């Protein structure tokens, strides 16, 4: 699930 900011 990490660590993610966008798309």
């Amino acid at each position: 699930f990490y660590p993610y900011p966008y798309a």
């Epitope: 990490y2 660590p3 993610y4 900011p5 966008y6 798309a7």
Partner: single-chain antibody, 241 residues
């Protein structure tokens, strides 16, 4: 323990050499947040260099820095690195690392910056389909107490599929690192006063300061992260007459 991003000290290097800048994170779970890096040539805007996901060690770069900058992480020491190779005078700038969150896709915590001077001296210290962010005015002189309004226009809608608009405002006080002010159009970040308010939609956005105070002076940057690559506006300097 409050979050802190602590970068390595100023560097003086010969053209052609390489430099490895560090960014030690503390106060949060290092592998749960993307670490982004930004370049700021003296007097110019912020440029996205690339991102690293500390959990996977996977990266993504701004096309122009791909092949120039190498982003790595050391999870044991909770430290991120950026190596720059074949340095020239055009690499002289301040580089920042900054934590990027998911909920806002914004840069909530910034390092203090690392000044790199590329020199033989012994002492001292494109377009494509990228979304373009245009800020107006370039400069806004006021008397303290005045209200202020600055605008930011994107070359295309920043409305995202999930219905959110990832348009944020940052404030960089003279000599300091940028700080997040407003994320996702109108949400005030922690500790940001009510005199600041963000509005707008699609491609048209505005930041308002009902009453300018001394601590508000500096350069305001809008940025979008709805589309990759991330892009920043050119900056609006708020200063006293």
């Amino acid at each position: 323990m409050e979050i802190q991003l602590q970068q390595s000290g100023p560097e003086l290097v010969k053209p052609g050499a390489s430099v490895k800048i560090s960014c030690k994170a503390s106060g949060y779970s290092f592998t749960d947040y993307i670490m982004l890096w930004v370049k700021q040539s003296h007097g110019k805007s912020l440029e996205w260099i690339g991102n690293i996901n500390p959990y996977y060690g996977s990266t993504s770069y701004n096309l122009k820095f791909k092949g120039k900058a190498t982003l790595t992480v050391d999870k044991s020491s909770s430290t991120a690195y950026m190596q720059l190779n074949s340095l020239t005078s055009e690499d002289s700038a301040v580089y920042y690392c900054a934590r990027k969150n998911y909920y806002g896709s914004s840069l909530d915590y910034w390092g203090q910056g690392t000044t790199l001077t590329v020199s033989s001296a012994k002492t001292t210290g494109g377009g494509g389909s990228d979304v373009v962010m245009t800020q107006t005015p370039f400069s806004l002189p006021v008397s303290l107490g005045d209200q202020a309004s600055i605008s930011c226009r994107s070359s295309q809608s920043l409305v995202h599929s999930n219905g959110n608009t990832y348009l944020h405002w940052y404030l960089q006080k003279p000599g300091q690192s940028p700080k997040l002010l407003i994320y996702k159009v109108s949400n005030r970040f922690s500790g940001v006063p009510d005199r600041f308010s963000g509005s707008g939609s699609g491609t048209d956005f505005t930041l308002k300061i009902s009453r300018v105070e001394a601590e508000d002076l500096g350069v305001y940057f809008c940025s979008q992260s709805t589309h990759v690559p991330y892009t920043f506006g050119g900056g609006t300097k708020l200063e006293i007459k």
